Design a protein around this ligand. Structure first.
Ligand code: HDD
Ligand code: HDD
Ligand code: HDD
Ligand SMILES: [Ca+2]
Ligand SMILES: [Ca+2]
Ligand SMILES: [Ca+2]
Ligand SMILES: [Ca+2]
Ligand SMILES: [Ca+2]
Ligand SMILES: [Ca+2]
Ligand SMILES: [Ca+2]
Ligand SMILES: [Ca+2]
Lengths: 678, 678, 452
């Protein structure tokens, strides 16, 4: 409905050309009934031409993603820190559009690739569109925008054969990481659970760069944007993410779409760390450096307002595919900093839309339009939709009475550069020495994970580096990892049969910080939307009756329940043939269905051992599992799952079963089921 | 109207970016007051990017042109001959847009080049956009669309140096004409006054091709479109066209704009010749052949309705430059014929818009939009401005209830191919023998011109062919001209010092037809809008008083009056410095200004002899000229203009002068002032 | 090779701009060591501009695929059935490029999706480029090219949310299949092991359409192309295909690349079924119908020659991504039929390259160039890489002595339409009744599989 003016309804009417002539489109015009097709068939050509030209270039990065509409609401009048209009009153509402994404994969690649994730937010403010183009990880791989093609060439598929898709698990990527040590911080994040988030709803957003808040009196402060998930933080496990990439490439976009449709639209607190200009170098690193984070212990979050996504697009292409974000879409009250990564981005995103749109009027696309008047002397270009009345589009003029008027700090609520900003020194292509510590913060991050999380990170590196063919690259990787942590280097080296280099303790330390750990962020605050598969059978009416009773009790608490059986009928959502443990956050077997879990169990209706495999996979991936009905021993024995296990449930009573099971869904993952290096 | 919704008003307000953020655009952001410009200046880059991308490819032909809005009104219910909805009721009104053009010149070439002219009309009908993409000449140079690049390459500038602009007066064009005899008919028309019309308003429009009118019962007839000017036919003379190309390259577009602004918007009767399918070959040629005309003596005109242009565009680029005509834009009640020129056009115009627009959604540009709902399954593409609600865009479907429905002869007022049409025979790349007479109709045309018009045509050929460097091409040209008329070939040969080949009488004849002659079409039916220059002086109060008196009497009758003097003041529109005879349809000298017309007359305010030259040029070019307000033999003697001449006026009385002079403006051209062969 | 001249070696030397000026590309130019980046940094902007414009529109179908170079060798002089030059002598070798693909998925989608597969072969013949743009299944879903967007919209992701990727397992696809019964034959093939081949090497190629072989004397025969794998036929099982789509999205392109690198480049016998014009309707269906196959029991294969793929590309983008196939790339000795599916394709492939390339000169891309001289009056356009010497590019001319000369049946080894072809009847948008049996051949196919 925010873009309702542009909607086209095709629920009634006769087929027309694009110029409104009624036509048909099902048979070609031919010279006789078995004859050749005629060139004069305009119905054919207009239709096929349109089809032939449907595609546009995918985004150069973040090609794979999905979007939704929502609302931002301010929690206060923030005039005291920023002139930004959308923040100027308690309760003030601004429409938003958000797109989430991976980075490296092409447009049909799997959502559950291991990657950095995009989190791009447009605020359609009453003083212009404002975009915060962020990621789910607070730090970036490189310290200068000029290096971006080098990073991206290295992580994208090898350019002779275009292998591998959507993965850093190849020689070129690890060559780059090992030769460019700035990469270490983002690399540790990507190799953690933050690389495989459970959903877009269960990840945070970060602006990464230091920006400025600028007041109407001209004074400024330095800020970092943090969008903090109200759904909690959660990750997949890698082995799960891999199967899920095959069983459901669309998992994150389906999860988001479904949450919105069920009235469970995700929320984030839009927050900032705010510090003085004088603190640019007070925290032990440079705030211009996008590889560094300010620990919350040094600078607490201020909650500015609520972001809620609650409406899905009408047409994916027109809205999600065509949305064209820019950090140059800035409003009065915000300003840039001299972060050399940010500085270069400002060029890139204005330029790249020429590629995507194929012409310069991409801001006139519905999803890109602002919600306030446009007054400027920009004219013409391919695809020009406006018919400008002002026939004197130059400044200065008298023939249009000096309009449009110039807007600045003192008139017309103009954008203005923070007036205390200066530059000094030589014009240089040199890196600030203040940027040179690439290893301390990677170590702070590693130190801040729980022991099982540290093991998962080590295991991601063991997985990826084991697939690097070059022994020289592997050696170089261990050299870099060793500068962060000797223990990481030793543990990774053991999987690839190299020796780790001797400890180099220059950057070793034991400091920790709060809020980076997924495992350590406590049970989820809500289990609404989490998926429960109930494994049943049509061969026992009692099994379907147990399943119906469980359904009622679980749906009441907002869980999405799937009853699985051999064949569809009323009460049964999915067959075993299409079911997989990657489809559920918890698995329940009804004890009327125990016969399906025997080793002699076979059916033409699903793959051999599928029922048991679902249960076993769920258990092994750390999910809450259980048997409901009181006869648990046949299922749990076939699965080799101990009755006494944490996150294993066995109760006769449906109500008792569900109460226990729901504590398990909040715990989310039972990390005791993962072996640790000694 | 799609146009009104996209109008943008910039008569008030502060400058904004394209996303509504208020900004400035007059100074670059710099590192210090004398410092380098910053990459983070998004104000700079968005403005310059837009500027950098303002241009689009000019049309491949008809690049130079001008457009206006109007209305078409049907004179009757034409159901008895066509199902076309815009013709279905007396008084039914349909909005139109017309673009007029030359063919060969690039976008900034002169209006008054010698060329064929475009006359392209869009009817925004209640059953879809219908375009008649015509010319001011009823026949085309070639008989097969596949030859169009050959024609166009030959007439456009030579591709090594891109010389000459907007002219057929070079070897390649005459080589093509001489080797491709089909060209002879259109060549004679372009070499007549039809090549240099006085204005877009003083020329007719022709669809050229035979089309079909198709009734709702399925029966069809063959038609030719003729748009007959209500302003009359008028031409420049060549020497005038040449000076005018330099003094005012915008002459025809200015004329059109001014006529509309003064409430003199031009009108045409939209007419057809209508004949039976059985007459395809009855008139001595093939109605599928686009080098042939049906003489009105064999098939008279039926007036279908009135076309009036009465509103100028708001933005030239958005409306005139972007309008994208297609003969594929057809409506129920009209059909194509197997004219091989027409057949190929249908392909070209859909394809070429991809070039111009850079993307497939060019029908969404306001000027291209229809005025009825669009219901189809065309999706995506660069520049997609719609948000389609229908998420099952395929036929056949049940998930969108089978909508959109197919439209055809029987339902939904669908377009349908005339059901009587057939094809028979081999699949061939062969020209019909019925097309082979390239010379009889050029002769009919030449025979139908008056003696002075025949001389102007001979003189245009003498001019152009004298500029052909190759003696072989010149010989080849005479061979072809000789097949039309031995007399033409003899008379043209005399100017280039070759002998004409012996008479070859195979195609010679003495037949004539009405309605092709400009000179023979009698006085103009109105003199409104015609331009009178009054040559006066500031050195005599009496001269300005004579000028004012004449002004009053001429403006009363809707003439556009310019008083010329040495310097501007109240009552004086233009200086001698800026004045030229090409600016006027008639020239009057006031008796009090006689001193300026002496040979010793000199001034720092205008070139030597300018006043007299204007008068003499006007006389020489056949225009009504006179001296008003005494016994006024001094100006006529200085100019060597005889008082007794036709179109020369000499009166003391303002009233008597104006009454005589206005009959001269209606006569328009005094052809007795041009010498004839023998 | 048009490619050899365009190879660029970067194994030595200093970084340069695209105009040969030595530069650096690792740090932005800034006003001071902690200062803002300067607009005057041309090194920055040229590098980022290039990066920002690296992507081009993926193909509208068959976006997911991979290619290799090879050679075709004729087994005989086939003059007795076709004038085609690449078939005119025993042992005659023609370079080829082949791209294999899925249909429905986007770039980055998994190789082991269940789908129809593309098998597109370019023969760079000594009389022009000849493309056979085929699939691994011999029949197509629809009987008229105007329906193609309907088919493709139905099988591609639902357009509100773009779910699901690379799959017909959703409502819209099965709605279309159930409402358009022509789809049954190809549906059965796609739902068999032919939908999930073990590799590109283990599947066959088919032209699908009936074409014509035309002799120099003007006589013609009807043909069907079958490229028969020398590696044998093999399929995945579905449960395996699903896991493989997650564990190795690059499975088929890796398999092909590896086989070529190890000296096991895949081979096919390029074969035809050949029948007389008079047999258009002899086999119990219409040979103009692309939902029908001629049983080999009625028309046996003739082996024409050997196709071998034996060299991987140097640059995927420049070769594989940019190769632009067209059924309009036809040579003397081959002609079309009035198959309404084929007829419409001829339009689509010329048009769609404007989308991909962004300009009209896509035949000048090295991978698209022929291996013979080009002589025509095509001029200008964005990205014009030639400098044409002929300054009179029109026919007829005397100023360039009538060159280039027209080629036809009796001149310059011109292409010519088979001269026995005719058309007759009303100009109609009507389906031939001869196309109406949508179910017998699906049943023949099902009957011909083993019980498992
Ligand atoms: C100098 C080049 C460059 C650099 C250094 C970056 N990016 Fe970027 N980014 C691009 C150049 C770019 C781009 C090529 O301009 C893209 C591709 C599509 C588009 O619209 O912008 C893009 C897309 C893009 C999107 C997808 C937006 C959407 O959903 O459409 C996200 C979330 C980001 N980027 C986030 C970042 C973050 C958080 C960065 C570092 C802090 C970052 N990028 C650095
Ligand atoms: C096979 C190609 C071809 C052939 C045989 C013709 N033309 Fe055409 N014409 C074009 C290819 C074309 C074009 C390249 O497609 C243009 C350029 C811009 C456009 O929209 O279409 C065009 C533009 C064009 C315009 C300008 C429309 C405007 O103002 O925007 C007119 C008036 C004509 N043509 C009229 C004719 C007439 C009366 C023809 C013969 C009866 C003719 N053309 C044959
Ligand atoms: C009317 C449109 C239409 C129809 C009926 C078809 N296709 Fe097609 N096909 C296209 C329109 C198209 C296209 C849009 O024009 C593509 C996409 C990009 C390109 O080069 O052409 C294409 C690509 C394409 C490719 C990929 C070539 C490559 O690897 O680059 C193959 C293998 C085929 N198709 C095969 C077929 C077969 C065997 C068909 C039926 C027998 C068929 N197509 C019908
Ligand atoms: Ca690699
Ligand atoms: Ca984790
Ligand atoms: Ca373009
Ligand atoms: Ca020339
Ligand atoms: Ca029809
Ligand atoms: Ca669907
Ligand atoms: Ca199989
Ligand atoms: Ca032919």
């Amino acid at each position: 409905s925010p873009l309702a003016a542009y909607e086209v309804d095709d629920s009634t009417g006769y087929l027309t050309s694009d110029v409104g002539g009624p036509i048909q489109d099902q048979t070609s015009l031919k010279a006789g009934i078995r004859g050749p097709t005629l060139l004069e068939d305009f119905m054919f050509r207009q239709k096929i031409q349109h089809f032939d030209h449907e595609r546009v270039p995918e985004r150069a990065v973040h090609a794979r993603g999905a979007g939704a509409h929502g609302t931002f609401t301010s929690y206060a009048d923030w005039s005291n820190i920023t002139a930004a209009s959308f923040l100027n009153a308690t309760g003030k509402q601004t429409p938003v559009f958000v797109r989430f994404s991976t980075v490296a994969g092409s447009r049909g690649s799997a959502d559950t690739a291991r990657d950095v994730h995009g989190f791009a937010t447009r605020f359609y403010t009453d003083e212009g569109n404002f975009d915060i183009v962020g990621n789910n990880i607070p730090v970036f791989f490189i310290q200068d925008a000029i290096q971006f093609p080098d990073l991206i060439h290295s992580v994208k598929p090898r350019p002779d054969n275009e292998i591998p898709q959507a993965a850093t698990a190849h020689d070129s990527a690890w060559d780059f990481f090992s030769q460019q040590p700035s990469t270490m911080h983002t690399l540790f994040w990507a190799m953690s659970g933050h690389g495989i988030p459970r959903s877009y709803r269960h990840m945070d957003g970060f602006g990464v760069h230091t920006f400025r808040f600028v007041k109407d009196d001209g004074s400024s402060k330095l800020i970092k944007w943090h969008f903090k998930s109200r759904q909690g933080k959660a990750s997949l496990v890698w082995e799960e993410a891999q199967v899920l990439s095959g069983k459901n490439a669309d998992f994150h976009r389906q999860d988001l779409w479904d949450a919105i449709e069920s009235g469970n639209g995700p929320e984030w607190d839009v927050c900032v760390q705010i510090v003085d200009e004088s603190q640019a170098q007070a925290f032990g690193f440079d705030l211009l450096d996008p590889t560094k984070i300010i620990p919350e212990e040094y600078a607490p979050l201020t909650k500015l307002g609520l972001l809620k996504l609650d409406r899905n697009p009408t047409n994916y292409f027109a809205e999600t595919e065509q949305v064209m974000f820019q950090p140059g879409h800035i409003v009065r009250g915000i300003d840039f900093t001299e972060d050399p990564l940010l500085q270069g981005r400002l060029f890139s995103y204005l330029d790249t839309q020429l590629n995507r749109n194929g012409g310069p009027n991409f801001e006139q696309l519905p999803i890109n339009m602002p919600r306030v008047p446009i007054h400027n002397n920009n004219r013409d270009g391919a695809g020009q939709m406006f018919i400008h009345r002002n026939k004197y589009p130059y400044t200065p003029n008298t023939l249009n009475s000096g309009y449009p008027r110039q807007a600045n700090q003192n008139a017309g609520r103009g954008f203005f550069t923070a007036p205390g900003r200066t530059a000094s020194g030589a014009l240089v292509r040199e890196v600030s020495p203040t940027f040179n510590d690439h290893w301390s913060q990677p170590r702070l991050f590693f130190n801040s994970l729980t022991p099982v999380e540290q093991q998962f990170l080590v295991n991601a590196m063991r997985f990826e580096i084991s697939l690097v063919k070059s022994e020289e690259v592997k050696k170089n990787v261990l050299t870099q990892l060793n500068r962060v942590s000797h223990d990481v280097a030793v543990r990774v080296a053991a999987a690839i049969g190299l020796g780790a280099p001797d400890a180099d303790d220059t950057y070793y330390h034991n400091n920790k910080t709060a809020g980076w750990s997924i495992v350590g962020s406590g049970p989820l605050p809500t289990i609404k939307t989490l998926r429960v598969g109930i494994l049943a059978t049509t061969s026992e009416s009692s099994a379907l009756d147990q399943a119906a009773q469980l359904r009622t009790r679980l749906e009441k608490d907002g869980l999405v329940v799937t009853v699985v059986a051999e064949t569809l009928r009323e009460g049964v959502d999915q067959t075993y043939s299409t079911a997989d443990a990657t489809g559920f956050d918890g698995v329940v077997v009804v004890d009327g269905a125990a016969a399906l879990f025997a080793s002699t169990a076979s059916s033409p209706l699903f793959p051999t051992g599928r029922p048991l495999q679902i249960f076993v996979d769920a258990y092994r991936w750390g999910k809450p599992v259980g048997v409901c009905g009181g006869k648990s021993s046949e299922v749990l024995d076939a699965a080799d799952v101990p009755e006494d296990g944490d996150g294993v449930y066995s109760e006769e009573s449906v109500d008792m079963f569900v109460e226990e099971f729901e504590k398990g869904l909040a715990t989310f993952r039972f990390t005791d089921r993962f072996a640790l290096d000694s």
